[PDB]
């Protein structure tokens, strides 16, 4: 789940488009359609991850949305920007899925955001790794995020792009902050909820070695390749201030809304069961019908 | 990961279900039949049935909610279900 | 009751978790500023 289904073969499609970029740039309609697809995935997966009761799921939808982000990147005639994006994607997204697997193994082989043990007290290394990975996927300056979704966001704000795609990708960045801090204030919140025998402990030396091996890349390799590479992308230096930090402003806006939704669950009152939360918490509302109706129709005409 | 030895879940059942302060510990026992030995029906069992299963890391069968009543029954089902054989 | 005592409960805040030893970052402030300052001063 953390190697394949995070950053190696789910990136294969956008990677193939990158390899086929010289043909891609010739046509611009497919560029707009790829913008639409990469926006709509950053919609569905991210909003479904807004309320997901499983740590694997949230980071998986973070993956899929960010893959749609290089889809947007190849749709705004930036193959190599998407290529740097997959390059540092392999570092950081795998890194957060590493943290997810670590908490899973330590927390009684469980993944739901419910029944956490206030892990930060007893899960420190994973806590720091998860926080910096969360900041990275929400465009942390100088980190992998800066030479990533941050760059792609200022590019899409700069380049002539679909409007709805443009607003959608900042909504996506806000949601990226949202669920990334959701795992933060659920897992390491500080209220223990777990079996009486405390198993949350990263004492395995090899686990520490591997986690830090990917950790240094998620800290360093974000920029240990960004300026070293030959100048290959569009070097837009000047731009309007309000959208100059459009990536940065939507990241901090997502942070503040994220903490707002965090503390709204910290109150004493009852949480809304309305249809909006339902749409939020059933994996984008798409699979449920597709796993039921089309299979029935096809195999019933087979019968 | 422990084998959850008979003494392990045995300690579990003298902390959980001996967690019950509604009945004073002096009349409490591992054979305690809560319906008349303690005077509280299986009703004031099901709630803590849900609590203890949240601790051991297992799910009591919903079909097996009834009759699952005394600490001896707790160790019984835990031992048979968790192959507590050491 | 153990899951309310300070041993496992009462964790630092979510930003506080993010500020994992950020006072060492404030030390990094000074060390980097002084590094550039002595680089420029002696050159």
């Amino acid at each position: 789940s953390a190697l394949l289904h995070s950053s190696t073969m789910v990136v294969a499609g956008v990677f193939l488009l990158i390899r086929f970029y010289p043909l891609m740039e010739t046509n611009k309609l497919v560029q707009t359609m790829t913008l639409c697809l990469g926006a709509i995935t950053t919609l569905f997966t991210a909003l479904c991850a807004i309320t997901q009761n499983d740590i694997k799921k949230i980071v998986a939808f973070s993956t899929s949305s960010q893959l749609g982000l290089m889809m947007v990147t190849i749709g705004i005639n930036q193959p190599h920007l998407a290529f740097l994006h997959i390059c540092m994607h392999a570092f950081f997204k795998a890194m957060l899925f590493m943290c997810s697997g670590s908490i899973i193994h330590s927390l009684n082989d469980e993944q739901d955001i419910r029944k956490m043990g206030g892990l930060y007290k007893a899960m420190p290394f994973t806590t720091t790794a998860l926080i910096i990975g969360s900041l990275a996927l929400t465009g942390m300056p100088y980190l992998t995020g800066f030479y990533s979704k941050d760059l792609i966001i200022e590019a899409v704000n700069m380049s002539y792009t679909n409007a709805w795609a443009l607003l959608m990708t900042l909504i996506a960045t806000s949601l990226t902050a949202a669920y990334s801090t959701r795992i933060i204030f659920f897992a390491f919140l500080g209220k223990p909820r777990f079996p009486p025998l405390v198993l949350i402990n990263e004492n395995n030396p090899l686990l520490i070695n591997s986690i830090k091996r990917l950790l240094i890349g998620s800290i360093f390799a974000g920029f240990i390749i960004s300026n070293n590479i030959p100048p290959m992308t569009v070097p837009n230096t000047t731009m309007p201030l309000y959208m100059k930090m459009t990536a940065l402003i939507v990241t901090i806006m997502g942070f503040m809304l994220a903490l707002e939704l965090n503390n709204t669950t910290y109150y004493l009152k009852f949480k809304y069961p309305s249809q909006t939360y339902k749409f939020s918490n059933m994996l984008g509302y798409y699979p449920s019908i597709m796993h039921r109706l089309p299979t029935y129709h096809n195999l019933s005409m087979s019968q | 990961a422990p084998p959850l030895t008979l003494e392990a879940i045995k300690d579990r059942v003298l902390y959980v279900l001996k967690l019950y302060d509604k009945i004073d510990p002096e009349k409490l026992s591992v054979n305690s039949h809560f319906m008349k030995d303690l005077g509280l029906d299986s009703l004031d069992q099901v709630e803590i049935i849900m609590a203890m299963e949240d601790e051991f890391g297992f799910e009591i069968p919903d079909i097996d909610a009834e009759k699952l009543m005394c600490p001896q029954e707790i160790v019984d089902y835990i031992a048979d279900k968790k192959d507590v054989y050491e | 009751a153990w899951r309310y005592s300070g041993g496992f409960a009462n964790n630092v805040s979510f930003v506080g978790a993010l500020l994992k030893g950020f006072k060492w970052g404030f030390a990094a402030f000074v060390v980097a500023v002084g590094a550039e300052y002595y680089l420029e001063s002696q050159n």
């Binding site: 009486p196 405390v198 949350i200 402990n201 004492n203 | 990961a1 422990p2 902390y15 | -």
Partner: peptide, 20 residues
């Protein structure tokens, strides 16, 4: 698996979070 576990469990206590 066997006895003498490194993080050998004191019941409901901090499982020796190594300061290293």
């Amino acid at each position: 698996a066997g006895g003498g576990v490194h993080i050998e469990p004191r019941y409901r206590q901090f499982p020796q979070l190594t300061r290293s």
